[PDB]
């Protein structure tokens, strides 16, 4: 299996995937996905049958290979990336719009940042550069400022950049869809103030204990849902994320689990862990 | 367009690297594509020919540089591209991948089991009935037959939209609470159990989102959500409305007067939620 070309492993994995997620796989799946010759696809299936003979049985009528009752995946899957592929499409995205390969929807996306804005911030992070941006903030409206970006973030809802803000001299999030212009500058980065190692809220990890909400009649449903152990799920997140994510995850973070207005499945067992976390007040019910 | 698919892919990876880093060298192509070192030069030459005003080789740095006049050679799927830079380069079928840059996506908790998602996807593809074990919030553990038709990545969990034969209704099942899946040979009643009869699924609700009225700077929300005429029109399946309005933190109360949650957006027309099952999950929504 490891003697093969990268291209050959990718096409084998696509056979594995198609058998696992559809009932079946034929030469047309490989020629559509990879634009290989039909004769190449035939060799692919032969390599697959040789590597996993008990995974596939051939159907002579329709000329498709069928998933058996004893199927075991030939490869390990990145589950996050695999779920992105079935809900988005098969490429890396660089060759135009793609579409999901199955009846799968992901309706939670609203608008995305502009390609050029994300690319420019990404470039500045890679080059360790200062950038001038225009930014329209909720707190003060439109303006300009210099920032020293260090990380791009897909948070639940929007994209933001974690950066040192030279306007107010603090590390801060900037929502990418509110960045209007990006200009790479030659100004020097102060590696004693402005770089990632000084970002305390970024570098502080908070250890959260999530438990089934006490009001639930069937907490065992939540134990299975979140793959909990010892009645809890331990999650470690950067303090700079805690507010965003606790609200996004709809976690009851009130002391007694009685401040609600919502329909919580999870409660934060140890709200003490949010002490000193900038923007913990975004977490539902946190006081 | 006259090139092989493998060659167009290598040209798109050059375009991406120049766009997202300042630069691109042969090592990026051999790492990503495992082509011979001599193949990468062929790629950059092909790229230089197709877009000469985008690149500028530096002999000392041994690297091709993005010019000030760069315009991407390809169109990008923005959702999938943002996924790739926050997840990694494969399709995911060859093992764990890692982001190609300083980019984090910290909102994922656990995912459904590979075999469970695959079994449901297979049943949807074959238009089959499945027996599942399911642990519900209302009744705990049990088993039932369901007729799945669509897989959903909602904001928070994955679910399958299906006809539930236990209570004879269309319904969501969270994939992480499905423990066993068994494909059946049982016949589907295409007059009761298929997608066309799923009313909440087929009903599209037309939401008008506006900057929240309590904001001092609504102009920040206007650029954020790319609004026009001070509103964003969003069309979603009724079966999604509750989930998504909560996930998006949209104020859906009649007279606002709701800012204990720091909303950036308000639902201008909560009348559009009447008769939507689980509208109650929408922040501040009150019908009766």
Numbering used by the authors:
A (entry chain A): 7 to 293
B (entry chain B): 8 to 295
Give verbatim lines from the article.
Using a combination of reporters and electrophoretic mobility shift assays, we discovered that BrxR acts as a repressor.
We solved the structure of BrxR by X-ray crystallography, to 2.15 Å. The asymmetric unit contained four BrxR dimers, supporting our previous SEC data that indicated BrxR is a dimer in solution. The WYL-domains do not appear to directly interact, but the C-terminal dimerization domains extend across like two left hands shaking, interacting through the opposing C-terminal domain through the palms, and with the opposing WYL-domain through an α-helix at the utmost tip of the protomeric dimerization domain (residues 202–232). Two sulphate molecules are bound within each WYL-domain. We propose that ligand-binding at the WYL-domain basic patch could induce conformational changes to BrxREfer that relieve transcriptional repression.
